């Protein structure tokens, strides 16, 4: 897998962000995470505020597609997003602001990594695991 640069256009909510990728605007859906939705579930506004902060204060945003299907049926890009080298997908799960989702069409490269972060958040009874 390789990381490619992108530019923040707009944070939408916990699991979705609009980025300029290779010249055009695109909506991305974070791989392997399910965050509470604001469109308003419990912790939904916290999860979206958390990612908004990460995206807006970053010097560099990068997107990493996995080896499976790269867009869902709604036309969203499916990827791991990094803010200053830190994976947002991972940070959400570790902070207990998202659960690890079921693998979608072969996109499982970092599933183990996220599974471990989630077990730890669970042990610490963080947010959603309260």
């Amino acid at each position: 897998l390789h990381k490619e640069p992108a530019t923040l256009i707009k944070a939408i909510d916990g699991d979705t962000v609009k980025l300029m990728y290779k010249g055009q605007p695109m909506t991305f859906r974070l791989l392997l995470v399910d965050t509470p939705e604001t469109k308003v579930e419990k912790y939904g506004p916290e999860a979206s505020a958390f990612t908004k902060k990460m995206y807006e204060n970053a010097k560099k945003i990068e997107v990493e597609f996995d080896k499976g299907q790269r867009t869902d049926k709604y036309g969203r890009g499916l990827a791991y997003i990094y803010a200053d080298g830190k994976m947002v997908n991972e940070a959400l799960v570790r902070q207990g602001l998202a659960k690890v989702a079921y693998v979608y069409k072969g996109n499982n490269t970092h599933e183990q990594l996220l599974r471990k972060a989630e077990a730890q958040a669970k042990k610490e009874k963080l947010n959603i695991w309260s």
Side-chain angles (χ1 to χ4, degrees):
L1 302 193
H2 77 288
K3 304 175 187 189
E4 302 165 77
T7 299
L8 202 222
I9 285 181
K10 185 185 200 301
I12 295 161
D13 72 352
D15 64 14
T16 298
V17 61
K18 201 151 191 176
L19 262 20
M20 190 66 102
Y21 171 69
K22 290 201 288 72
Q24 80 294 308
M26 224 181 113
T27 296
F28 284 81
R29 168 70 166 83
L30 271 46
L31 277 175
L32 299 161
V33 301
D34 279 330
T35 58
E37 237 123 308
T38 62
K39 301 184 176 189
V40 187
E41 286 173 279
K42 183 70 173 304
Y43 291 115
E46 283 76 7
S48 53
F50 180 85
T51 63
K52 177 166 196 305
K53 169 82 179 173
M54 276 186 96
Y55 294 135
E56 286 173 358
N57 299 135
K59 289 159 58 166
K60 300 175 183 184
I61 299 289
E62 298 174 284
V63 308
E64 176 180 64
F65 286 94
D66 207 328
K67 63 199 174 59
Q69 297 183 194
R70 292 156 185 185
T71 63
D72 63 11
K73 64 211 301 175
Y74 299 97
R76 306 177 293 179
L78 299 170
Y80 301 109
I81 311 282
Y82 295 83
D84 290 336
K86 303 201 186 183
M87 202 204 292
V88 181
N89 311 55
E90 192 192 0
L92 276 172
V93 177
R94 185 56 185 88
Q95 201 71 203
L97 290 172
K99 296 174 173 172
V100 170
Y102 295 139
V103 173
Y104 182 76
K105 313 300 183 185
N107 293 308
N108 75 345
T109 298
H110 300 307
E111 167 187 26
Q112 286 312 297
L113 172 65
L114 298 180
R115 247 55 221 269
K116 291 180 183 181
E118 182 189 61
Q120 196 46 53
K122 206 158 307 187
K123 290 180 188 48
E124 306 181 354
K125 305 193 70 185
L126 275 185
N127 300 305
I128 289 174
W129 305 115
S130 279

